[PDB]
Design a protein around this nucleic acid. Structure first.
Ligand code: PAR
Ligand code: MG
Ligand code: MG
Ligand code: MG
Ligand code: MG
Ligand code: MG
Ligand code: MG
Ligand code: MG
Lengths: 134, 402, 65
RNA sequence: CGGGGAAACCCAGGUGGAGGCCUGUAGCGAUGCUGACGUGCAAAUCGCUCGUAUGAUUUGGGUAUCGGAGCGAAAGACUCA
RNA sequence: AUCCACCGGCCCCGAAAAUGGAUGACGCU
RNA sequence: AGCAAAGAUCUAACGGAGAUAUACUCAACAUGCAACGUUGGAUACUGGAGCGGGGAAGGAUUUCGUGCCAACGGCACUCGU
RNA sequence: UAAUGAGAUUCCCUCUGUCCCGAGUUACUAUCUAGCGAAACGACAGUCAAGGGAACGGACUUGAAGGGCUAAGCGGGGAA
RNA sequence: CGACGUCGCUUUUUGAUCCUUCGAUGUCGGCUCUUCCUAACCUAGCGCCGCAGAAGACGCUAAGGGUUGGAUUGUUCACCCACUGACAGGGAACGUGAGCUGGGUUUAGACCGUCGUGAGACAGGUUGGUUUUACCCUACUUAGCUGGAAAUUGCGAGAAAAAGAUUAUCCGUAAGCGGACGUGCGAGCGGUGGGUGUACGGUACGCUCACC
RNA sequence: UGUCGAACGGCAAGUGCCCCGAAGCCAUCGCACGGUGGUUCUCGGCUGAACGCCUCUAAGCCAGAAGCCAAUCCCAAGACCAGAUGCCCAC
RNA sequence: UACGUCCCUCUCCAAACGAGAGAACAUGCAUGGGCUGGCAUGAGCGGGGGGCUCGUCCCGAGGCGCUGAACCUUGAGGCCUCAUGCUCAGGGACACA
């Protein structure tokens, strides 16, 4: 009940099972999409994520201080091409996420690469620490 | 025993029977509700589909994330030669229905109008509307015209006129039909005495599309879907495809019913005709009522884009040709292939939502090629990327040799 | 809008036509790279120079003029 | 043939071509698809995949052992569907 | 002319299931 | 229902009853289609663990020439074991 | 218990249409024609709702449908 | 909310029975797909609270719509992880094997434990173990052709109709009232004929043949 | 890789393989659209007695659910349409 | 008797087959030209690691030039009348006891 009807429709990229990068410097190196917040159910359909979506994750490779637990990440990059409303189709080289709180605070201090305009606008802690808002 | 999990069922069950359309043309099954406080005006117009393209426009939508920002919207181009009125019918209310009183005719009908009465026009006597033409100006026939015009004023609640597409001004090579498409357009507005005077005045006179619609409104598009033959259950209804190790096949519905009721139901999805269906598709926002190339050599030119260019792309609309007449440009898609006649009808939905009141100004119309990837907007831009090529330097060698 | 030009071939990318792309090693000046074709993005992936391909604008401005 | 050692003997480079050794044709089998076919091409076949392929190996002709009996690396298997 | 305790007749409530449905049907007040 | 593995046939001239087959006032297409053998030519295939050339077992005239087309060669035949 | 296993099981890596979630192309069929030409099956036949009944009717009772004849499908019934 | 009692509904459990089937109704669960029911989990209106708000208890009218992704298990069930507005409960021969799958029960091989002198046994565990046929009738899906109101015939005459319904031109309303070619020769409303420009290219509008 | 002597043009490998590829088809993998009136249930009421006051109910009214019925939407005269019409014939 | 309809012929908005949309001397069809797109610089000819021969002349993958050349572009069916070819009283059957 936080972010769903706030940004436009984006082509979903990362279903449950996906293993994305951690651009956050929380010591982790890896996420694993466990589910997606905002998934109203459809039979046989997986929870899939897009740029602005908060996911439920677990670190599969990183510090054991936060590895075997269910965390909250926010997607910032995806390889799946999404069409913006100004008619431009755009995509990243890699998928990445950044771990957050249940309320959205970034839990680290810096992002590796860029972030999108789609995920920075929903999350002001993500738009602050990002070196380039794509 | 109950189904173990729930999904919503496949396909809307109100578009049954999914059989071929009875006729290829869009036909309104209902016109808008007659407001007798309005001015008498026509309510539908036949246009032909001529490919589609996209535009750029800035958005006036306060509150939105795209407020005063430019979007790219796809639009469909629909060529509209004017239709010529040839008749006036009038309908009277009965407890059975709505019965036709009669029709007056125009005293002068087109060759392509009375071509619609012949399966073979060129190998015929061609003498249709030939005894009605000569009886209409006898003493007794001028009476009988005014006899049934008065019977409209007595009994009719619904006045309609009969138009036809006028295909010889549609100078199109691929729409191969030469007989005209005939429909009835309902007059709405005023009382019945005010409808007939508008039905008499535009009789044997062509009506143009910008006299029926405005530039930034919406409409309904009665049109017949693109046909796809006999398709199976996965293409037609959208059912889930079975696991790979299934014997006798994947693209089937596994259970078509219980033991009891010992019959297959109409709700169970089966195979058969997919496509070539009539659809009405309300709230198609109109963006540009165009004007003929004999009037406008610069059709796609905007205030904000001063490139002198027409609506027809480079290398033409694919499979269609050139838009040679007036045209309407609608937001999005309309049901049907190119070359198919389609009926733009005034809306029955309340046109009061703030998405539908929005006035449209464009900024760019894509006139690039639809063959391949479009790269140049005009041919003037391809002659500046490419300089003089080889075939140009030997045509310039023949022009100096003379 | 505006006509972006392609990164590889410097073609004309009019609105609603190309396909934009942004890599992990992003430039500060060109974070997002606009491409006009998949053929332009394919010769960008195998790391060909825009010159030495005879149909790009880089070639045509150093050899033929 | 070289090297180390007081000796016992060790260490290295080749040579050699051992094995119910290995990959893999033919041959001999028949794992999976629970594939195709299932009024078949076929009263058991087709396809790909698979087991083995110097041995307790495969095979022709000839001979010898049978009906409460024969033969059996044993499945009551086989003894002219 | 107004209250109180009891008892009866018809009617209602109590009275919720999986194909569309049955005083045999229409209907009847 | 079917006659769907083993890529594939095309061409012209001859042969043959198997054609180029028409009641008028019709130039031909729109009123004789399909199919056969042989030689030439084109195109392929098998690919020397061969739709190559010889033998055993088994068959016993299927060999060869000439005629010939009733029935057989699950379509066809002017061809044929 | 090393080596060996068309043996039984579990996890990880790579990997992918197994899946999300389907789409599109090919050869051969189906399909249409020419030639040829079967079988299984077959009491009679063949639209349903309820009632009753050997207590799950195509035939009986009362209702509801049903103009005739076809081509391709299809697997709910014929307790096929 | 409600003991002690008590009156009942339900046939998604199980027991009891033995009516039907042993010249055979394919005997589990998934998967798929459609529909039904209400004893309402979410959604639409509500009443009522030990209802201040926020969350929520109980109830009513309502089954229109929705009711998931997973780990383990062959599982129905169970149990946790997570999303959600919510993850309601059931029926249809314990819906659905010429729809699939074959994990499991439910043969022949083999192993183990307990039993048996043994052959063998085991609502004990384990492993390996052919899923055949539609071209018929109907149903359903689409795709063609074609008669028929005495639903094929009777000639068996019923118009959501006109108003002489008794003779007869129309127009417009009942009281009124507009005009209607005159006698083979004429004329009038008209369909088609020859030459120098008008309305939104070629059709109309200016100035020999039928009918009155 | 083989093969027409080599280049040329090709061809064989049941489409040799690799890259780009029109058109067509197609993806919640893109894009566009998805609307009106009433009836009346629960219920809260209005007038108002039976029952000299009281009372939503007994007559009578009001407002009113995602239900229900229409509009829109899809098929549509075996719904047998003296609905209208064009041209021939026949009366 | 006529109006006509249907087959054969042509087209593809339709299509398993029928049915449908159309056209039937028509830029209708055929080929060409131009456009539009696709690929990426054709055969041919002429001026570089090295290596032969007796400064010169030959062998040499690659490169460069003519050359955004060459080819392909509607066809289950892109565009333009931009040019020319082809049609020469369309044929059969019903309507019709
Ligand atoms: N009878 C002749 C003798 O050969 C001798 O020659 C021998 C030695 O020089 C030398 O002997 C070596 C030596 O390096 C060292 N000190 C000791 C070593 N064991 C010997 O090694 C010898 O024996 C070993 C076996 O162990 C062999 O593998 C090898 O063939 C050989 N090199 O290798 C030669 C043997 O092949 C001497 N010349 C001398 O004693 C005498 O002449
Ligand atoms: Mg089509
Ligand atoms: Mg081996
Ligand atoms: Mg045994
Ligand atoms: Mg065949
Ligand atoms: Mg070969
Ligand atoms: Mg034969
Ligand atoms: Mg072994």
């Amino acid at each position: 009940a936080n972010v769903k009807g706030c940004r436009f429709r984006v082509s979903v990229a990362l279903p449950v099972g996906a293993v994305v990068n951690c651009a956050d410097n929380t010591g982790a190196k890896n996420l694993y999409v466990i589910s997606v917040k905002g998934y109203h159910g459809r039979l046989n359909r997986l929870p899939s994520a897009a740029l602005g979506d908060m996911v439920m994750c677990s670190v599969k490779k990183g510090k054991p201080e936060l590895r075997k637990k269910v965390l909250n990440a926010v997607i910032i990059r995806q390889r799946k091409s999404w069409r913006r409303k100004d008619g431009t189709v755009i995509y990243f080289e890699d998928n990445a996420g950044v771990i957050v709180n249940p309320k959205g605070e970034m839990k680290g201090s810096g992002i590796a690469g860029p972030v999108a305009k789609e995920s920075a606008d929903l999350w002001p802690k993500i738009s602050t620490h990002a070196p380039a808002i794509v | 025993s109950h189904c173990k999990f729930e999904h919503p069922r496949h396909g809307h069950l109100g578009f049954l029977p999914r059989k071929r359309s009875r006729q290829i043309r869009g036909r309104a099954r209902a016109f808008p509700k007659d407001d007798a406080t309005q001015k008498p005006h026509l309510t539908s117009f036949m246009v032909f589909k001529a490919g589609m393209t996209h535009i750029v426009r800035d958005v006036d939508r306060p509150g939105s994330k795209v407020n005063k920002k430019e979007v790219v919207e796809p639009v469909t181009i629909l060529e509209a030669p004017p239709m010529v009125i040839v008749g006036i019918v009038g309908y009277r209310q009965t407890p059975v229905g709505l019965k036709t009183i009669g029709t007056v005719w125009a005293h002068h009908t087109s060759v392509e109008f009375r071509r619609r009465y012949y399966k073979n026009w060129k190998q015929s006597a061609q003498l249709a509307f030939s005894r009605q033409k000569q009886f209409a100006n006898t003493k007794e026939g001028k009476v009988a015209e005014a006899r049934t015009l008065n019977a409209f004023a007595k009994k009719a609640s619904v006045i309609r006129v009969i138009a036809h597409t006028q295909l010889r001004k549609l100078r199109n090579h691929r729409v191969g039909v030469k007989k005209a498409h005939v429909q009835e357009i309902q007059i709405n507005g005023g009382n019945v005495a005010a409808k007939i005077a508008l039905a008499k005045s535009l009789l044997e006179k062509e009506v143009r599309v910008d006299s029926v619609f405005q530039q930034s409104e919406a409409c309904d598009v009665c049109s017949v879907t693109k046909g796809h033959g006999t398709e199976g259950v996965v293409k037609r209804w959208g059912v889930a495809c079975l696991p790979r190790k299934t014997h006798r096949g994947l693209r089937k519905v596994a259970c078509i019913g219980a033991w009891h009721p010992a019959r297959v139901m109409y709700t169970v999805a089966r195979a058969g005709q997919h496509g070539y269906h009539h659809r009405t598709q309300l709230n198609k926002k109109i963006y540009q009522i165009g004007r003929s190339v004999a009037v406008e050599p610069n059709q796609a030119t905007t205030t904000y884009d001063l490139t002198a260019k027409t609506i027809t792309p480079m290398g033409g609309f694919v499979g269609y040709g050139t838009v040679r007449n007036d045209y309407v440009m609608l937001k999005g898609s309309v049901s049907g292939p190119r070359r198919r006649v389609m009926t733009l009808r005034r809306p029955m939905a309340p046109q009061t939502s703030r998405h539908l009141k929005e006035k449209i100004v464009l900024k760019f119309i894509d006139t690039s090629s639809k063959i391949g990837h479009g790269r140049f907007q005009t041919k003037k831009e391809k002659n500046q990327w490419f300089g003089p090529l080889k075939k140009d330097r030997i045509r310039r060698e023949e022009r100096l040799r003379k | 809008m505006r006509t972006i030009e392609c990164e590889f071939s410097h073609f004309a990318v009019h609105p609603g036509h190309g396909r934009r792309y942004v890599p992990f090693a992003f430039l500060s000046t060109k974070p997002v790279l606009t491409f006009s074709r998949p053929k332009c993005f394919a010769l960008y992936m195998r790391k060909k120079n825009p010159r030495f391909i005879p149909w790009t604008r880089t070639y045509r401005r150093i050899h033929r003029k």
